RNA sequence: GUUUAUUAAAAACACAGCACUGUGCAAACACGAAAGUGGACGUAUACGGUGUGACGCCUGCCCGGUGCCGGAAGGUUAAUU
RNA sequence: CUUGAGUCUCGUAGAGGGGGGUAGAAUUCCAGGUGUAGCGGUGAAAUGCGUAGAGAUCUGGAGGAAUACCGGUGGCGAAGGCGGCCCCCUGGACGAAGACUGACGCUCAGGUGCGAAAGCGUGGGGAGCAAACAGGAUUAGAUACCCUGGUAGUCCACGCCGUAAACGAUGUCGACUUGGAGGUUGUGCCCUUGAGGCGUGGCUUCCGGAGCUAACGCGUUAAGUCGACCGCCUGGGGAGUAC
């Protein structure tokens, strides 16, 4: 597999949505014979701008090692979910643990 | 052209020119939902707009709005129907029912398809406006909730909201500029129909004109009587309008219900 | 450096216009210069960073 | 680019920001484009910081 | 007759003339000046001290309220860029912020050839 | 490029012995996957010439090594091209 | 291919192609005092009207006149009070 | 047989290519608020836009093209060329311990393929720019330069056309031959205590010695000393024209 690294931004009014997005995604990476090696929650914080209108998200990271094919399934949830933002996820780079 | 399959292009052979033909939808013949079709263009007496007649006909087919909702369908085959250029598709729901549907881009080989509100968003099957994201290309809607009119032309026939418009009303056919409708409404959600069954030209009249309307040509023809403009000793000078209907432009379709569609050009 | 995370330790290599500031007045190795501008980039779209400065 | 100060005065601390942007990336502008006629005289005045 | 106390004044710093209104907070006309309207025109205007006596002419016509303290906002090069912020200041105006918004795009639209003599 | 567990997979299916990824029969088959592979990642984008230029690359290189078994051992050269389904 | 059945078969009508224009569906348009019907069990890759008449290379300047399209601030102006 | 050439391993840098996403700045346009007699443009001017309310300003929306800063005497590519961030498919280059094959190589008429821009066909798209075209100005005239507009086109797909001062005006491959300063990227090593210091490869700038050269200049990336193969030249015009 090769590794990962999805920091995705959900709605500053659909916090409490965060903590059940996370058990999904999670949930599935794992049942997708993949690995989580990292996770934080960020929650709430000001922005540079006001990216899609507001001043304010929720931030969440990640860095999983799943096979690409189960990430890729991500993008469609993570698009057809006015909760999130913005998405945005890096390539695998050597497994990232811990430090942020 | 510029996607696959390309359109075949008969040769130089006795007056040969542009076809239509698919990939395939294997098999030549039909299921049985059908009736048996009208005519010819008259109306109860006279015969009303002119131009209208040629053989070769039958075969109705159906299924529009889809009533029925969330049970699974399959794609059973595409097929042909005539007069409308927007293929059709078969499809079986998990319960033995067979509705038709108008054959979206990607479909063929069986796939998801699936109605009622709350559905996988591909090309599925209807669903309401609501229900739906910024549908870039959603499909046949209908001015009213219940009902399936709209662009049932799929032949490349699209429609696009705008993300998310409140008040319950969007859409923005294609020159049909901007329209708000009802938004309790549903779309197909996948709009296609597949645009090169219309890029082909008939070929020389007959054998591809005749086989579907009348010489719908009838230009001056003179004779101060037959046509609003006439005569002369060989050429037209003047207006050409037919029962001074005045072709140059003037627009129509004036007060009553509706006409609460938006923005509408005049370039 | 090679991340975007860390914009503790970018504030540095920008401005008042969060432009990225250039390699002549900073000479990081050339290399590393430009792993700090592709940070300065991507960084920015996680609104961790701005991009110009009057909006 | 911005400012702001407490005690009123005009003192200045706007051609601060007048290093970076301001009248240059502007005039850069202004009129046409470039093409070649950069990618050549930008490799051409970089003759002349030698000496 | 509002008062709006307080309210920033854009600067339109352009080459062939130079224009200021002292808008209010919001972003609402409350005043406006202008070179070509300040006696000389033609192109005499441009001029740093062309433009000063152009926006310092808002002090006669903003000031029917009781403009406090206000900012400023200068756009695009030319002389008046600094001449206005001048005469503003001692006009008896305030200020708050001085800010220059000037359109930078990014390589976005192509310019005009123009020029070639 | 091509992945280590068929890379080093296939070498020890051609190689006369273990490890010898200089072989003829071994890199020359080794060429033949990357082609085939290739084809249907040229199937599709089409304009990637860039691509090709070294896909070709290989094609005659893979040739340039077809030639040499022929003129060093006759038997190993109808012996491999079967094995690979060559010649088309 | 069509045409003056019974003096004209043609260079005329048609044609496929092209263009302009109109029509958001209870469509425009047409038959009809109306109900209703055709258009179409179609829905803008669709339908109508006008002109040109494969295809090739093309299709220049004029918006003063008339017509049409937009604006509609101001002038003039019906019934009505 | 192994040093040429190639394979394997493990790393490294990259605007190499094809596909799909996505972000922010700016322009234009549509709508509405504020506000009022100018705006725009030039050397001046005028056309043009403004009291039907522009310009300015602010709020919301639509759309297309290109990606400031980093950006460099930088990098990648056979050439043409290739700059936002992200993912997917993919090519080449280089270094190092090495392990492997064993001359499998160099060049290449014909042949096949790739080719800036402009242009062509079908269908899309169209913000800015802009051949044509139209006004205004300049002038002796001005079928121009300048100004106000503006269509094809520029953008996308797919197919065609194959040209450029397609330039290093310098064919590809290999071996030799004083030096100096610098750039970029790999690797070994050094109280690795450091920015760092010493080597050893790749690519690349500038100066320059011998030599070469008609001179200018080229000068280890040669236009120096040699070897292998290919393309080409034989006075100017007529003519890259006619057939
Ligand atoms: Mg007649
Ligand atoms: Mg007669
Ligand atoms: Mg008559
Ligand atoms: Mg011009
Ligand atoms: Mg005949
Ligand atoms: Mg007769
Ligand atoms: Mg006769
Ligand atoms: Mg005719
Ligand atoms: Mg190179
Ligand atoms: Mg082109
Ligand atoms: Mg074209
Ligand atoms: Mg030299």
């Not at chain 1, 794992?30 to 929650?41: Q, S, V």
């Not at chain 2, 039958?58 to 029925?68: E, G, L, Q, S």
């Not at chain 4, 400012?3 to 240059?24: M, Q, T």
């Not at chain 5, 105006?93 to 003599?117: M, Q």
Request: charged residues 30%; aromatic residues 6%.
């Amino acid at each position: 597999m090769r590794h990962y690294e999805i920091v995705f931004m959900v709605h500053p009014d659909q916090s409490e949505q965060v903590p059940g997005m996370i058990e999904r995604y999670t949930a599935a990476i794992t049942g997708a014979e993949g690995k989580i090696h990292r996770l934080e929650d960020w929650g709430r914080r000001q922005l540079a701008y006001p990216i899609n209108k507001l001043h304010k998200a929720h931030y969440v990271l990640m860095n999983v090692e799943a096979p690409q094919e189960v990430i890729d399934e991500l993008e469609t949830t993570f698009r057809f979910n006015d909760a999130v933002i913005r998405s945005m996820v890096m390539r695998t780079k050597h497994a990232v643990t811990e430090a942020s | 052209v510029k996607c696959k399959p390309t359109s075949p292009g008969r040769r130089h052979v006795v007056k040969v020119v542009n076809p239509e033909l698919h990939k395939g939808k294997p098999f030549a013949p039909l299921l049985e939902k059908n009736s048996k079709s009208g005519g010819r263009n008259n109306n109860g007496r006279i015969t009303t707009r002119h131009i209208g007649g040629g053989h070769k006909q039958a075969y109705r087919i159906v299924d529009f709005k889809r009533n029925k909702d969330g049970i699974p369908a399959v794609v059973e085959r595409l097929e042909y129907d005539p007069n409308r250029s927007a293929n059709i598709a078969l499809v079986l729901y998990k319960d033995g029912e067979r509705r038709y549907i108008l054959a979206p881009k990607g479909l063929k080989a069986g796939d998801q398809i699936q109605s009622g509100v709350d559905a996988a968003i591909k090309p599925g099957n209807t669903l309401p406006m609501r229900n739906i994201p910024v549908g870039s290309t959603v499909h046949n809607v209908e001015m009213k909730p219940g009902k399936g009119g709209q662009l049932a032309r799929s032949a490349g026939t699209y429609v696009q909201i705008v993300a998310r418009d409140g008040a319950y009303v969007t859409l923005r056919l294609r020159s049909g500029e901007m329209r708000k409708v009802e938004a309790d409404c549903r779309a197909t959600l996948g709009e296609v129909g597949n645009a090169e069954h219309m890029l082909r030209v008939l070929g020389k009249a007959g054998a591809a004109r005749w086989r579907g309307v009348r010489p719908t040509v009838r230009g001056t023809a003179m004779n101060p009587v037959d046509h609003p403009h006439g005569g002369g000793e060989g050429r037209n000078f003047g207006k050409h309008p037919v029962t001074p209907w005045g072709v140059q432009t003037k627009g129509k379709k004036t007060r009553s219900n509706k006409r609460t569609d938006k923005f509408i050009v005049r370039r | 450096e090679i991340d975007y995370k860390d914009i503790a330790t970018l504030k540095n290599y920008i401005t008042e216009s969060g432009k990225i500031v250039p390699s002549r007045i900073t000479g990081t190795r050339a290399k590393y210069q430009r792993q700090l501008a592709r940070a300065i980039k991507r960084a920015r779209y996680l609104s961790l960073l701005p991009y110009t400065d009057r909006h | 680019i911005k400012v702001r100060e407490n005690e009123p005065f005009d003192v200045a601390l706007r051609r601060f920001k007048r290093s970076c942007e301001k009248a240059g990336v502007l005039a850069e502008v202004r009129r046409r484009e470039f093409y070649e006629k950069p990618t050549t005289e930008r490799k051409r005045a970089k003759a002349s910081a030698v000496k | 007759r509002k008062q709006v106390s307080d309210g920033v004044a854009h600067i339109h710093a352009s080459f062939n003339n130079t224009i200021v209104t002292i808008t209010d907070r919001q972003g609402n006309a409350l005043g406006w000046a202008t070179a070509g309207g300040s006696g000389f025109r033609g192109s005499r205007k441009s001029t740093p001290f062309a433009a000063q006596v152009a926006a310092e002419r808002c002090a006669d016509a903003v000031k029917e309220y009781g403009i406090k303290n206000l900012e400023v906002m200068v756009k695009g090069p030319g002389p008046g860029r600094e001449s206005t912020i001048r005469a503003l200041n001692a006009a008896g105006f305030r200020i708050t912020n001085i800010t220059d918004v000037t359109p930078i795009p990014h390589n976005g639209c192509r310019p005009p050839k123009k020029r070639r003599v | 490029s091509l992945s280590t567990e068929a890379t080093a997979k296939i070498v020890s299916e051609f190689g006369r012995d273990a490890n010898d990824t200089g072989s003829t029969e071994v890199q020359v088959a080794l060429l033949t996957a990357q082609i085939n592979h290739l084809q249907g990642h040229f199937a599709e984008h089409k304009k990637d010439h860039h691509s090709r230029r070294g896909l070709l690359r290989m094609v005659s290189q893979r040739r340039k090594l077809l030639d040499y078994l022929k003129r060093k051992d006759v038997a190993r050269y109808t012996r491999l091209i079967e094995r690979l389904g060559l010649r088309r």
